[PDB]
Amino acid sequence: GRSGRAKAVARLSDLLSTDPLGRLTEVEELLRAHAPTAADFARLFEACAERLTRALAEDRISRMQVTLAYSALQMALRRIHHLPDPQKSVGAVLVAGVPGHKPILEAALAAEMLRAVGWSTSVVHPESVAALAARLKTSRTSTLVVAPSLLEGTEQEADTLRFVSALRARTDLPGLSILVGGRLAQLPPSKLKDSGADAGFAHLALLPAALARVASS
Amino acid sequence: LPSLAPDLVRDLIATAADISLLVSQEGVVREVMANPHHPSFGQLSEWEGRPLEEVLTAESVAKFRLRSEGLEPGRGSVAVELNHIDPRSFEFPIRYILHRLPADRSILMLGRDLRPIAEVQQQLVAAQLAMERDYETQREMETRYRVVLDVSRDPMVLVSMSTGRIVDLNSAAGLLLGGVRQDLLGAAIAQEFEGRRRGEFMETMTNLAATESAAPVEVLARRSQKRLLVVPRVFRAAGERLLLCQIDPAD
Amino acid sequence: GSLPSLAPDLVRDLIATAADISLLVSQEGVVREVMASFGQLSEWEGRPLEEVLTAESVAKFRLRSEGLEPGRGSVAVELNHIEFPIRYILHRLPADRSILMLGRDLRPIAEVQQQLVAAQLAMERDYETQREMETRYRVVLDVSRDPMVLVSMSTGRIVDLNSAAGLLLGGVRQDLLGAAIAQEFEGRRRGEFMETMTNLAATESAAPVEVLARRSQKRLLVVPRVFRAAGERLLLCQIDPAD
């Protein structure tokens, strides 16, 4: 019940840290019960990721183990949430990772949340800024969501800043709206504007709120 | 163990570990000790004279500081997984035990090579990426399916082989049967046709589909009470079977 | 030569922690000391080393160690105990001609790799169970008697069609895949034709464009619809005979 709810983050983190593939059914069971929407899944995943990050920092688990956990989460996600891309759409959006990073689960969750509220969505894990710009132009998409890697280190922040700057430095993407997450979105809001992003989502589950703000202005 | 000369001591350490680093109290790499019997790491001498922190990732810097700052002589640290940056910008992991040496408070780092594990990790990440790229292709195809089915003037109904219930259809089929979409989705297909029952109907359509140059089946729709003709086809989707029925007026 | 002087107990502990298993073996072949989840191995001390090696490994150890001299380098040999394999690096110590065997267990790396391989296989199999929409799309398009052609708005080329459309256009399906759609119709050009289609689709008028198909020489009526499909911009043409 709500007892189950209170225990979900701890139970999931344990399962993911020990035998994620062998106990994948239990992982799925917990997420089925406590993640009725992709936004709920995002809240639970991000909480677990903080715990896994700390465990890795204290050497209680290895990067290999985090990799197994992440694969199991991806499998669990696809057993539960897989919305059609909406045909009656409020707009088009592209979710991308930063070159040199693989936010596969985070980008998938971003796409689920955006599809759930009516956005026609595509997802790209681009090789470069140029390749991403090409995809934006071909799909005629003017809104870009940069998916953060919750289980990768702080080098991604400077990488994302260089990424956003590089995008803004171009002249072939006029009017592009850019949303960023992770640590960059957690700064005081005044700092956010300098980076070149139009809005930040401080947690993955706050992405719809951020997109709604950008779409308004 | 008997009495040991310094050169021999160095060689024993260098060959007991897969790789070992001697780092000054200040944090400068003093020596990279190669095990010649272990797969090469390439030239790492360039690390010598440079701060250890130059060759570690940010989380590994913090982890090194965490396990070394309070580390006193007498016992090794807990094992620490550190991620290195190679001179050629290669990134590789080593699991180290740290020892504080009492004579000069240097830290000797005794390593186990994790490169083979990292290689297989990269294969798994690549497969995760490939699966999600294919997932997105399926989403394109699902929209194509939706549009083709809905726009098609050819009346079509899709039925689950397992339950015998309608799983999809288009408006053209709905109009012939005499029902709206939401009422027909989930409905037992046999009960849409007068005189039919699930067992015999499903078996009849399944056998008929499995023949060549089959004739359409005459049915009488329960709702519209219109005489219709049905042509069944059977295919496998996601492990289970679907029955696709094309429906035409008999008159 | 940067290491400071190291006390003997420390040297022992550095070796013990760096290696997975180390054996000090007397000149005469007796295990003097074992330093190591391996099992106790306490019983090995005081026993001849050959008693704890397979016969193949006895032969290998004897060959690699007989010519091994102090201060003349070290030698690596893979040995199996009475079975499990260990990479041993052998040094002969000068004080007493004992042999120090520095062992690396490569089983853990192997098992960790197997975990990752099995995870990959399981993940790939999970996605195998959800590839249904491409199949549904193919079957519905193929079975449908309503003539339809799907065109990439990005490239202006046919991406798919059914046999009913093929008949009207005048070629088999496989020959029309990839064809520029405007060039199938006499007097049409890519730019102006796509504009015509896009404009009509937005009007939702569905009042058809009259074309003459090049291959079949049939006059046709084309009704366009435009849609987005997970990042792909597509044009669907429904086709009917005109004359």
| 3-class SS letters over chain C | CCCCCCCHHHHHHHHHHHCCEEEEECCCCEEEEEECCCCCCHHHCCCEHHHHECHHHHHHHHHHHHCCCCCCCCEEEEEEECCEEEEEEEEECCCCCCEEEEEEECHHHHHHHHHHHHHHHHHHHHHHCCCHHHHHHHHHHHHCCCCEEEEECCCCEEEEECHHHHHHHCCCHHHHCCCECHHHECCCCHHHHHHHHHHHHHHCCCCCEEEEECCCCCEEEEEEEEEEECCEEEEEEEEEECC
How many Cβ atoms sit within 10 Å of the Cβ of residue B179? Answer: 20
Radius of gyration of chain A (CA): 17
Looking at the domain assignment, is residue C95 inside a domain?
Answer: yes
Sign, CA dihedral A199-A203-A206-A207, equals positive
- The dihedrals phi and psi of C206, each to the nearest 5 degrees, come to 60, 10
Q: Between chains, do B59 and A153 touch, taking CB under 8 Å as contact?
A: yes
> How many CB atoms sit inside 10 A of residue A88's CB?
6
Give CA angle at B177 (B176, B178), nearest 5°: 95
Residues B239, B160 share a domain: yes
Residue of A168, A157, A185, A52 lying closest to A98 (CA atoms): A157
Which contiguous run of DSSP H or E holds residue A119?
strand A119-124
Q: How far is the alpha carbon of A180 from chain B, nearest alpha carbon, in Å?
A: 21
CB–CB contact C130 A67 (8 Å): no
CA atoms of B110 and B86, how far apart (whole Å): 18
Same domain, yes or no, for B108 and B159? no
Alpha carbon distance B99, B89 (integer Å): 27
Interface of A with B (CB under 8 A): 56-57, 59, 62-64, 67, 70-71, 74, 78, 82, 84-85, 87, 102, 104, 107-108, 122-123, 125, 153-155
| Count of domains for chain B | 2
How many Å separate Cα B18 from the centre of its chain? 32
The two structure tokens encoding residue A41: 């899944």
C71 shares a domain with C11: yes
Return the residue matching tokens 């990440």: B125
Of A63, A123, A154, the CB nearest to B81: A63
- Same domain (yes/no): B100, B2: yes
Class at the top of the CATH hierarchy for domain A86-217: alpha beta
Experimental method: X-ray
Instruction: Give the distance from residue A1's alpha carbon to the nearest chain B alpha carbon, in angstroms.
Output: 30
**Taking CB atoms and an 8 Å limit, are B138 and C130 in contact across chains?**
yes
B105 and B157 in a single domain? The answer is no
Q: Is residue B177 part of a domain?
A: yes
Burial of C152 (0-12, 13-18, 19+ CB in 10 A): middle
B169 burial (CB, 10 Å; 0-12 / 13-18 / 19+) is: buried
Closest CA to A146 of A108, A115, A111, A107: A107
Please give the C-alpha separations between residue B144 and each of B140, B147, B246, C128, C234, in angstroms, as whole numbers: 6, 5, 19, 20, 9
What does the alpha-carbon distance between residue C72 and residue A86 come to, in Å, rounded to a whole number?
A: 73
Which of C52, C84, C109 represents a domain boundary (last residue)? Answer: C109
Pair C23, C96 in one domain: yes
B44 and C43 Cβ atoms separated by less than 8 Å? no
Resolution expressed in Å:
1.8
Closest chain A C-alpha to C127 CA, distance in angstroms: 8
Write b or e for each residue in A112-138: b if 16 or more Cβ atoms lie within 10 A of its Cβ, otherwise e: bbbbbeebbbbbbbbeebeebbebbee
Contact C17, C90 (CB under 8 A): no
C227 interaction partners in chain B (CB closer than 8 Å): 143, 147
Residue of A nearest to B117 (CA): A64
CA angle C111, C22, C18 (to 5 degrees): 65
> Do residue C166 and residue C101 come from a single domain?
no
- Tell me where in chain A the CATH 1.10.1240.10 domain(s) lie: 1-85
Identify residue C227 by its one-letter amino acid code.
F
The verdict on residue C204 lying in a domain is yes
Considering chain A, tell me which residue range(s) the CATH 3.40.50.280 domain(s) occupy.
86-217
Looking at the fold, whether C90 and C164 belong to one and the same domain comes out as no
CB-based contact C186:C212 (threshold 8 Å): yes
Interchain pair C228, A89: CB under 8 A: yes
Cβ-based contacts of B236 with chain C (< 8 Å): 135
DSSP state of A187: S
Residue C133: inside a domain: no
Q: Domain A1-85, what fold? A: 1.10.1240
The torsion region of residue A196 among left (phi > 0), alpha (psi -120 to 50) and beta comes to left
Listed in sequence order, the residues at least 6 apart from C12 whose beta carbon sits closer than 8 Å to its beta carbon are B1, C35
**Judging by DSSP bridges, how do beta strands B227-236 and B217-220 pair with one another?**
antiparallel
Query: What's the rounded Cα separation, in Å, for the pair B31 and B14?
Result: 11
Look at the alpha carbons of A31, A33, A34, A37 in this order and tell me if their dihedral is positive or negative.
Answer: positive
On whether the CB atoms of residues C78 and C88 are closer than 8 A, the answer is yes
Residues C173 and C80 in one domain: no
Distance separating alpha carbons of residues A133 and A173, to the nearest angstrom: 7
**Are C8 and C98 within one domain?**
yes
Q: Which H or E element spans position B85?
A: strand B80-85
Question: What does the angle CA A63 – CA A64 – CA A68 come to, to the nearest 5 degrees?
Answer: 115
**Gap between the Cα atoms of A46 and A6, Å rounded:** 15
CB-nearest to A74 from B59, B128, B143 is B128
Give a yes or no: residue B142 inside a domain: no
Rounded CA-CA distance B152/C137 in Å is 12
Strands ordered across the beta sheet of A119-124: A119-124, A91-96, A143-146, A177-181, A199-201
Among the partner-chain residues A21, A120, A140, the one whose CB lies closest to the CB of C122 is A21
- The number of residues in chain B equals 251
How large is the C-alpha radius of gyration of chain B? 36
Are the beta carbons of C127 and A78 separated by less than 8 Å? yes
Q: Report the DSSP pairing between strands C158-161 and C148-152.
A: antiparallel
Q: Residue C237 belongs to a domain with what CATH number?
A: 3.30.450.20
Chains that contact B by 3+ CB pairs under 8 Å?
Answer: A, C
C231 touches chain B (CB under 8 A): yes
DSSP 3-state of A43: helix
Nearest CA in chain C to A21: C119
CB contact under 8 Å between A102 and B125, yes or no, is yes
Contact A73, A172 (CB under 8 A): no
Cβ atoms of residues C197 and C204 within 8 Å: no
Distance from CA of C82 to the nearest CA of B (A): 22
If DSSP codes are grouped into helix, strand and coil, which group holds residue A144? strand
- What's the gap between Cα C116 and its chain centre? 11
End of a domain among C109, C137, C171? C109
Residues of C (124-143) whose Cβ lies below 8 Å from A: 126-127, 130
Going by C-alpha positions, the residue among B179, B183, B191, B176 that lies closest to residue B228 is: B176
Minimum CA–CA partner of C33 in chain B: B1
- For residue B90, give both structure tokens: 């290669």
Q: Which of C109, C133, C157 is the last residue of a domain?
A: C109
CA A39 to chain B, closest CA, distance in angstroms equals 19
B190 part of a folded domain = yes
CB contact under 8 A, C119 and A135: no
Smallest Cβ–Cβ distance between C144 and the set B104, B106, B154 belongs to B154
Q: Distance between CA atoms of C123 and A41, rounded to whole angstroms? A: 19
Any domain includes C237: yes
Closest residue in A to B120 (Cα) is A64
Q: Is B108 in CB contact (< 8 Å) with chain C? A: yes
Closest-CA distance, B80 to chain A, in angstroms, reads 6
Query: Which residues in chain B touch residue C133, judged by CB atoms under 8 angstroms apart?
Result: 138-139, 141-142, 145
CA-based max dimension of chain C? 107
Q: Please tell me the distance from the alpha carbon of residue B70 to that of residue B82, in angstroms, as a whole number.
A: 18
Kindly report each contact of residues A23-27 with a partner whose C-beta sits within 8 Å and lies 24 or more positions away, as own/partner.
A24/A72, A24/A75, A24/A76, A24/C122, A27/A72, A27/A73, A27/A76
Q: Does a structural domain hold residue C129?
A: no
Residues from A contacting C (CB-CB < 8 Å) are 21, 24, 64, 67-68, 71-72, 74-75, 78-79, 82, 85, 87, 89, 92, 94, 120-123, 135, 138-141
The residue range of the domain holding B35 is 1-114
Sequence-distant (6+) residues with CB within 8 A of B160 are: B166, B167, B240, B242, B243
Q: Token pair for residue C38? A: 């391996």
Tell if the CB–CB gap between A63 and B58 is shorter than 8 Å: no
Residues B196/B219, Cβ–Cβ less than 8 Å: yes
User: What does the block give as tokens for C218?
Assistant: 């049939």
Question: In 10 A of CB C104, how many CB atoms?
Answer: 25
Q: What stretch of H or E contains B112? A: strand B107-113
